[PDB]
Design an enzyme around this catalytic site. Structure first.
Site, short mmCIF file in Angstrom:
data_model
loop_
_atom_site.label_atom_id
_atom_site.label_comp_id
_atom_site.label_asym_id
_atom_site.label_seq_id
_atom_site.Cartn_x
_atom_site.Cartn_y
_atom_site.Cartn_z
N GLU A 1 15.14 63.11 17.57
CA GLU A 1 15.94 61.95 17.94
C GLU A 1 15.39 61.39 19.23
O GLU A 1 14.77 62.11 20.01
CB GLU A 1 17.43 62.30 18.08
CG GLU A 1 17.90 62.46 19.52
CD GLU A 1 19.36 62.87 19.65
OE1 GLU A 1 19.68 64.02 19.28
OE2 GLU A 1 20.17 62.04 20.15
N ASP B 1 13.09 77.96 28.93
CA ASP B 1 12.40 76.97 29.75
C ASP B 1 13.37 75.88 30.25
O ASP B 1 13.05 74.71 30.31
CB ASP B 1 11.18 76.40 29.00
CG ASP B 1 10.12 75.77 29.95
OD1 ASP B 1 9.98 76.15 31.13
OD2 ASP B 1 9.42 74.86 29.47
N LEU C 1 4.76 59.60 25.30
CA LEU C 1 5.89 59.84 26.21
C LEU C 1 5.58 60.95 27.22
O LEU C 1 6.08 60.93 28.33
CB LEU C 1 7.14 60.19 25.41
CG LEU C 1 7.66 59.04 24.54
CD1 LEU C 1 8.55 59.57 23.42
CD2 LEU C 1 8.41 58.02 25.39
N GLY C 2 4.76 61.91 26.82
CA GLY C 2 4.36 63.04 27.68
C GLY C 2 3.77 64.18 26.85
O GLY C 2 3.78 64.14 25.60
N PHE D 1 1.47 73.34 24.27
CA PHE D 1 1.98 73.45 22.90
C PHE D 1 2.44 72.13 22.31
O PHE D 1 2.93 72.11 21.18
CB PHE D 1 3.13 74.46 22.82
CG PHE D 1 2.75 75.87 23.14
CD1 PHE D 1 1.50 76.36 22.81
CD2 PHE D 1 3.65 76.72 23.75
CE1 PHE D 1 1.15 77.66 23.10
CE2 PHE D 1 3.31 78.03 24.04
CZ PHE D 1 2.06 78.50 23.71
N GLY D 2 2.31 71.02 23.02
CA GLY D 2 2.77 69.77 22.42
C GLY D 2 2.39 68.44 23.03
O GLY D 2 2.19 68.32 24.23
N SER D 3 2.33 67.41 22.18
CA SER D 3 2.14 66.02 22.59
C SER D 3 3.22 65.18 21.92
O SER D 3 3.49 65.35 20.74
CB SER D 3 0.76 65.52 22.19
OG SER D 3 -0.17 65.72 23.23
N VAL D 4 3.86 64.29 22.67
CA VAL D 4 5.01 63.56 22.13
C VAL D 4 4.87 62.07 22.25
O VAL D 4 4.70 61.54 23.35
CB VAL D 4 6.35 64.00 22.80
CG1 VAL D 4 7.52 63.14 22.34
CG2 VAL D 4 6.63 65.45 22.44
N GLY E 1 2.80 68.76 27.28
CA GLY E 1 2.77 70.00 28.07
C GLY E 1 1.87 71.00 27.39
O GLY E 1 0.87 70.62 26.78
C1 LIG Z 1 6.29 68.61 27.45
C2 LIG Z 1 7.36 67.71 26.77
C3 LIG Z 1 8.59 67.52 27.67
C4 LIG Z 1 6.74 66.33 26.46
N1 LIG Z 1 7.78 68.37 25.56
C5 LIG Z 1 8.69 67.77 24.66
N2 LIG Z 1 9.08 68.32 23.50
N3 LIG Z 1 9.95 67.48 22.90
C6 LIG Z 1 10.11 66.40 23.70
C7 LIG Z 1 10.90 65.30 23.40
C8 LIG Z 1 11.65 65.30 22.21
C9 LIG Z 1 12.44 64.20 21.88
C10 LIG Z 1 12.46 63.07 22.74
N4 LIG Z 1 13.15 61.88 22.62
C11 LIG Z 1 12.87 61.10 23.71
C12 LIG Z 1 11.96 61.77 24.54
C13 LIG Z 1 11.50 61.29 25.78
N5 LIG Z 1 11.94 60.10 26.29
C14 LIG Z 1 11.54 59.67 27.53
C15 LIG Z 1 10.71 60.48 28.31
C16 LIG Z 1 10.30 61.71 27.77
C17 LIG Z 1 9.36 62.67 28.48
C18 LIG Z 1 9.43 64.11 28.94
C19 LIG Z 1 8.64 63.76 27.70
N6 LIG Z 1 10.72 62.09 26.53
C20 LIG Z 1 11.72 63.04 23.91
C21 LIG Z 1 10.91 64.18 24.25
O1 LIG Z 1 9.31 66.57 24.80
#
Ligand SMILES: CC(C)(C)Nc1nnc(-c2ccc3[nH]cc(-c4nccc(C5CC5)n4)c3c2)o1
Length: 273
Positions: free
Chosen positions: A89, A135, A12-13, A17-20, A15
């Site tokens: 979630e 942030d 999903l993305g 400190f993290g990969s999601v 930054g």
């Molecule tokens: C750097 C980043 C934004 C990826 N850090 C981050 N930390 N937690 C999340 C996070 C947590 C729960 C989430 N549930 C759904 C998403 C999501 N859905 C669509 C698009 C995105 C992108 C910005 C990451 N996230 C989610 C993200 O992202």
């Protein structure tokens, strides 16, 4: 523990400190998000009630988790030899406010009011439960497109809330207050109010007001878009150079621009569907 309990989608993305990853719980099919944090890249370690050393993001998310859905739910977390995995979630359909603003450009004011109100509610909830995010930006806000509900994400730069001075800072430069640029000192509430003013400016103008340290310190706000005077006032107020001149959260939400805010569900039918 993990592989069994969750199916893994694509990234999903990521930054600092993290990969999601997008993900699914196998037991109920509930959409999740799976965040991995490398131990060697963690600069700020937290401690639990248990007296166990984990990333600050886990401490902060546990402290704020309850009925309130303006902050992302921490469903579960795990430790591994070299990393931490957080299950969070995931609404469906969803969209990041950064991507959403990028697509639409400037948001209409009615929609900005709802969005910013909900963020304010969320940040108040964080402060209530002892948590400071540090942030606040479009990238760390998700829109649940069906319900018109916003969610704060990514507490990896966060800290326990304190009324004394902070001398460390890990969030986004362009969203950071002038006291940080010059003196490497700030206070939580006043600094968050700055970053919220940057956020509101972003929402109503399609972009952030400052790129370089010099513009942040000058604190002059030019509007490239048609924005109402009431909205302008509020933004300029949050972006006061001197922290004490900044409004409190009560004063933001009592401002004339924040009156007659839409409910989230109304917000979705008019603006998102
Ligand atoms: C750097 C980043 C934004 C990826 N850090 C981050 N930390 N937690 C999340 C996070 C947590 C729960 C989430 N549930 C759904 C998403 C999501 N859905 C669509 C698009 C995105 C992108 C910005 C990451 N996230 C989610 C993200 O992202």
């Amino acid at each position: 523990p993990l592989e069994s309990q969750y199916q893994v989608g694509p990234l999903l993305g990521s930054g600092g400190f993290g990969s999601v990853y997008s993900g699914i719980r196998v037991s109920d099919n509930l959409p999740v998000a799976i965040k991995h944090v490398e131990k060697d890249r963690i600069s700020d370690w937290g401690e639990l009630p248990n007296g166990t050393r984990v990333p600050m993001e886990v401490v902060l998310l546990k402290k704020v988790s309850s009925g309130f859905s303006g902050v992302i739910r921490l469903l579960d977390w795990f430790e591994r030899p070299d990393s931490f995995v957080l299950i969070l979630e995931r609404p469906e359909p969803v969209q990041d406010l950064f991507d959403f603003i990028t697509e639409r450009g400037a948001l209409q004011e009615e929609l900005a009011r709802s969005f910013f109100w909900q963020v304010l509610e969320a940040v108040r909830h964080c402060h209530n439960c002892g948590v400071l995010h540090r942030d606040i930006k479009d990238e760390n806000i998700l829109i649940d497109l069906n319900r018109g509900e916003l969610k704060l994400i990514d507490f990896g730069s966060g800290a326990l809330l304190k009324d004394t001075v902070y001398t460390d800072f890990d969030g986004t430069r362009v969203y950071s207050p002038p006291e940080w640029i010059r003196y490497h000192r700030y206070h939580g509430r006043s600094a968050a109010v700055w970053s919220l003013g940057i956020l509101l400016y972003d929402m109503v103008c399609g972009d952030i007001p400052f790129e370089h340290d010099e513009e942040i310190i000058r604190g002059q706000v030019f509007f490239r878009q048609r924005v109402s005077s009431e909205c302008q006032h509020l933004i300029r107020w949050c972006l006061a150079l001197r922290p004490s001149d900044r409004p409190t959260f009560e004063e933001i939400q009592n401002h004339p621009w924040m009156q007659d805010v839409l409910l989230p569900q109304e917000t979705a039918e008019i603006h998102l569907h």
